[PDB]
Amino acid sequence: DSTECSNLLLQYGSFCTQLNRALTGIAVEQDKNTQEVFAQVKQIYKTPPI
Amino acid sequence: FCGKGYHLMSFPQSAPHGVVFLHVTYVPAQEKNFTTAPAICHDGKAHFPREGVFVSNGTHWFVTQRNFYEPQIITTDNTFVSGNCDVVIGIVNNTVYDPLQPELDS
Amino acid sequence: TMSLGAENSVAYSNNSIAIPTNFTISVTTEILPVSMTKTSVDCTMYICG
Amino acid sequence: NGLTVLPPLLTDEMIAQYTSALLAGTITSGWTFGAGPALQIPFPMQMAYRFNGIGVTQNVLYENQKLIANQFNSAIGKIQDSLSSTP
Ligand SMILES: *[C@@H]1O[C@H](CO)[C@@H](O[C@@H]2O[C@H](CO)[C@@H](O)[C@H](O)[C@H]2NC(C)=O)[C@H](O)[C@H]1NC(C)=O
Ligand SMILES: *[C@@H]1O[C@H](CO)[C@@H](O[C@@H]2O[C@H](CO)[C@@H](O)[C@H](O)[C@H]2NC(C)=O)[C@H](O)[C@H]1NC(C)=O
Ligand SMILES: *[C@@H]1O[C@H](CO)[C@@H](O[C@@H]2O[C@H](CO)[C@@H](O)[C@H](O)[C@H]2NC(C)=O)[C@H](O)[C@H]1NC(C)=O
Ligand SMILES: *[C@@H]1O[C@H](CO)[C@@H](O[C@@H]2O[C@H](CO)[C@@H](O)[C@H](O)[C@H]2NC(C)=O)[C@H](O)[C@H]1NC(C)=O
Ligand SMILES: *[C@@H]1O[C@H](CO)[C@@H](O)[C@H](O)[C@H]1NC(C)=O
Numbered sequence: 456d457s458t459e460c461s462n463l464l465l466q467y468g469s470f471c472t473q474l475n476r477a478l479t480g481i482a483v484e485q486d487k488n489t490q491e492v493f494a495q496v497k498q499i500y501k502t503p504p505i
Numbered sequence: 506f507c508g509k510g511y512h513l514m515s516f517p518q519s520a521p522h523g524v525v526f527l528h529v530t531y532v533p534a535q536e537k538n539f540t541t542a543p544a545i546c547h548d549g550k551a552h553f554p555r556e557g558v559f560v561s562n563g564t565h566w567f568v569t570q571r572n573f574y575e576p577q578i579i580t581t582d583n584t585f586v587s588g589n590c591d592v593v594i595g596i597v598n599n600t601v602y603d604p605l606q607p608e609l610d611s
Numbered sequence: 612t613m614s615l616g617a618e619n620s621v622a623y624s625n626n627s628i629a630i631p632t633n634f635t636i637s638v639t640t641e642i643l644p645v646s647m648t649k650t651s652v653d654c655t656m657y658i659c660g
Numbered sequence: 661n662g663l664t665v666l667p668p669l670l671t672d673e674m675i676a677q678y679t680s681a682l683l684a685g686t687i688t689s690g691w692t693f694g695a696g697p698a699l700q701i702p703f704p705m706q707m708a709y710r711f712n713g714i715g716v717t718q719n720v721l722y723e724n725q726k727l728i729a730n731q732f733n734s735a736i737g738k739i740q741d742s743l744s745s746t747p
Contacts (some may be wrong), residue, residue, distance in 0.1 A: 466619035486669040493678040498661065500684035500698060508639045511696050522648075526641040530695045533631035541628035543705060543722050558705070560630060571709070574632040587719035594704070594725060595626065611716045615677055621688040621698045629692075629699035 511572075537574060542566075545579055546590035547601040555583050566599040578602055 464471070508528025516527040539560035545552040557568045560576065567576035568583050577583060580593050580602045590596050669680075687692035690706040692699040701709075704725055708718040721728060 458745070465712075465733045481668055483683065489668060489670050489675065493675050493682075494615070494717060496681055496685060496693065497616045498693070498698065499616045499677065500693065501618065501620045501681075502684045503620075503623045507644050508637070508641070510637055520642065522646050523644045525642070525644060527640045528641060530637050530639065532633060532635040532637045533633075533692070533699070534697070535633035536629040536631045536637045536697055536699050538622075539630055540626055541702065541705065543702075543718070544628065548614075551719070558626060558628065558630075572631060573634070585717075585719075586668070587717070588723060591717075593722045597701075597732065606624045612669050612675075615674055616681070619698065621684070621693075621700050623688040623700050623702075628701050628705070630724075631697075631699065 525576060526545050533572060542597040544590075544593045544600060545584065545599045546596045547599065549589055551588050551590050551596060552579070552584040552585045552586055552601050552609040553579075554569055555585055559585065566597070 506512070507526070508530040510530030510532040513529045513531050515529065518527065522602070533592060539562060542559045543553070543567065545559060554568050557570045558579075559570050559579070560567055561572075563577075568579050568580055569576050570599060570606040579599065663700040685698055686697065687703060690701050690702055690709065692701070707728070709722040712718060712719040
C-alpha cells in the first residue's frame with residue numbers, strides 16, 4: 456500500500472503489466488486445456504436405467 | 506486428428522504465417538433402427554457376418570455393412586460358420602442361402 | 612450456470628442397432644500457426660544507441 | 661500479499677458430467693458418437709467389432725463372452741483396489 460514505492464516502481468516502466476499479462480495468459484490457458492481435454496462432445500449422453 | 510467424422514482426405518492452404526487444412530470427412534446421417542443378432546442359427550450351425558452385421562426390419566433378416574444400410578440376403582458367401590448354436594447368447598433362427606444349391610439341383 | 616450440452620439419451624437395448632442410411636460429406640477448417648516474425652535486436656544499439 | 665487463486669471455469673461436477681457423457685456414449689454407441697450421431701449397438705456386438713479391429717474373429721468374443729465379461733469386471737475391480745492400496 457506504499458504510494459512512494461509505487462511511484463518509484465513506475466520508473467521501471469511496464470514490467471508489472473508484462474507479468475500480469477503473462478499470468479493472465481497462463482490462467483486462461485488452463486481453462487482452454489480443460490475444454491480441449493473434456494469438452495469434446497456437445498451432447499450429454501446418459502446410460503439406460505437397466 | 507483430421508477433422509470431425511471419418512476422415513476421407515484433406516487439402517492444404519497457405520495462410521500468413523500459417524496453414525489451413527480443409528478436412529473432408531464422411532459423416533453418417535439418417536440412421537434407422539433395426540433388430541440385431543450376434544449370429545444366425547441354421548442347420549445346427551452358428552453363422553457370423555464376414556464383414557457386416559445382421560439386421561432385421563421386423564420380419565426378415567439381412568446382412569449389411571456396418572457404416573451404411575445396404576441389406577443383402579444372408580448367404581454362405583458373406584457369413585462364416587464357427588460352432589453350433591448352443592454357445593452364442595442371443596442367436597436367432599433364420600435360413601442361410603446357398604448359392605451352389607440351385608446349381609446341382611438343375 | 613453454463614449448460615454443458617443438450618441431453619441425449621441413446622436408446623440402448625440388447626438387440627437393437629442403428630444403421631445409417633445416408634451420409635454427409637463435411638469439410639471443416641483447421642488453422643495452425645507455423646512461423647513467427649523473424650526479429651533481430653542489436654543489444655549494443657538497443658541499450659546504448 | 662497480492663496473490664489470488666482464480667477458480668477454474670469448469671467445476672469438478674461438470675468435468676465429472678463430461679466424463680459421464682463420454683462413458684455413456686462409448687458404452688451405448690461405441691465409437692459412432694465421436695464421428696457423428698450416436699448409433700446404438702449392443703455392447704457385446706461393440707466388443708466383437710473391437711475384436712475385429714485387433715484382428716480377432718467375432719466368434720471368439722461371442723463364444724467366450726461370459727469369460728470376457730468376468731475378466732473385464734475383475735480387471736476393473738483390480739484397478740480400484742490398486743488405486744486404493746497404492747499411495
Ligand atoms: C423387410 O424387407 C423385406 C425385403 O424387402 C420386405 O419383403 C418384401 O416386401 C414387399 C412389400 O410388402 C413385397 O412386395 C416383396 O415381395 C417382399 N419380399 C420378400 C422377399 O418377401 C418386407 O416386407 C420388409 N418388412 C417390413 C416390416 O418392412
Ligand atoms: C431354433 O431352432 C432350434 C432347432 O430347430 C429349436 O430347438 C428346438 O426347440 C424345441 C422346442 O423348444 C425342442 O422340442 C427341440 O428339441 C429343440 N431342438 C434342438 C435341436 O435344440 C429352438 O427352439 C428354435 N428357437 C426359436 C426361438 O424358435
Ligand atoms: C429407435 O427407437 C427408439 C425407441 O423406440 C427411439 O427413441 C425414442 O425417440 C423418441 C423421439 O425423440 C423419444 O421421445 C423417446 O423418448 C425415445 N425413447 C428412448 C427409449 O430413447 C429412437 O428415436 C429410434 N431411432 C430412430 C433413428 O428413429
Ligand atoms: C441422402 O441425402 C441427400 C442429401 O444429403 C439427399 O439428396 C436430396 O434429396 C432431396 C429429395 O430427394 C432433394 O430435394 C435435395 O436437393 C437433395 N440434396 C442433394 C444435395 O442432392 C438424398 O435424397 C438422400 N437419400 C436417401 C436415400 O435418403
Ligand atoms: C435381451 O433382453 C430381454 C429383456 O429385456 C431378454 O428377454 C433377452 O433374453 C435378452 N437377450 C440377450 C441376448 O441378453
